[PDB]
């Protein structure tokens, strides 16, 4: 995720009001089509936003470099159980860990 200030255009909606469109999203595709459709530019600002880039990599080379993907956030959602930091070291635990020692004993004795 890269957070940067990018250009945005303040047009005037032919129906009503004035809109804000990011310059990168209509950079070349329709940048001249707004004028034909009745949108005229009234202002240009610099607005800060985040962009997400994905790269496909292996241990020796980069296949895809900086493929821009949709969204302002990394699309992975994590879920944690008992989560914390001890000494700048993240630790997460469920319900099985603390029972491993006793159970391993119960298996041994029964064996």
């Amino acid at each position: 995720v890269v957070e940067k200030k990018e250009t945005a255009f303040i047009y005037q909606d032919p129906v009503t009001g004035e809109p804000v469109s990011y310059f990168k999203r209509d950079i070349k595709d329709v940048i001249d089509d707004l004028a034909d459709s009745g949108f005229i530019k009234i202002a240009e600002r610099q607005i800060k936003r985040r962009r997400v880039y994905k790269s496909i990599i292996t241990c020796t080379a980069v296949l895809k470099d900086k493929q821009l993907i949709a969204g302002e956030h990394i699309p992975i959602v994590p879920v944690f159980g008992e989560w914390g930091f001890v000494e700048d070291k993240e630790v997460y635990e469920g319900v099985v860990r603390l029972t491993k020692d006793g159970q391993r004993l119960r298996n041994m004795i029964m064996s």
């Binding site: 809109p19 804000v20 329709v30 949709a70 969204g71 959602v77 029972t99 119960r106």
Partner: protein, 132 residues
């Protein structure tokens, strides 16, 4: 020859180990903390989904004069969505899982019906439940 016997140490330690695992394998008292962590994860999921929707989806702007979907296509026939910067008009919360908006409306009407006394609003809500 003496009959085989389980030593007192073996039985005592098996009982103690089983009791220890029984006592330690109790999440919370209930999984309220785990459910709250899942709720936090779903709030993050909703944030990401809202960002993606603003990026790629066609979000209409509701005028008070009606949804005015303003979009246009390029010379390459590709349509480019035009989303205004007044996009973060709603925030994220956690609620019951519903497969459709009609189910959510039905649940909301039923919830309201369970608290309204049998007056005129009760009749209104019953007719509204038969509506959906």
């Amino acid at each position: 020859y003496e009959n085989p016997e389980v030593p007192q140490a073996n039985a005592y330690m098996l009982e103690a180990a089983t009791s220890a695992v029984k006592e330690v394998a109790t999440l919370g008292v209930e999984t309220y903390v785990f459910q709250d962590n899942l709720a936090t994860a779903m709030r993050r999921d909703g944030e990401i989904y809202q960002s993606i929707v603003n990026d790629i989806y066609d979000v209409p702007r509701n005028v008070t004069i009606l949804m005015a979907e303003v979009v246009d296509l390029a010379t390459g026939e590709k349509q480019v969505l035009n989303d205004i910067r007044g996009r973060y008009e709603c925030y994220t919360d956690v609620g019951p899982s519903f497969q459709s908006m009609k189910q959510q409306n039905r649940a909301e009407i039923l919830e309201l019906l369970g608290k309204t006394p049998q007056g005129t609003p009760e009749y209104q809500l019953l007719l509204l439940q038969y509506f959906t």
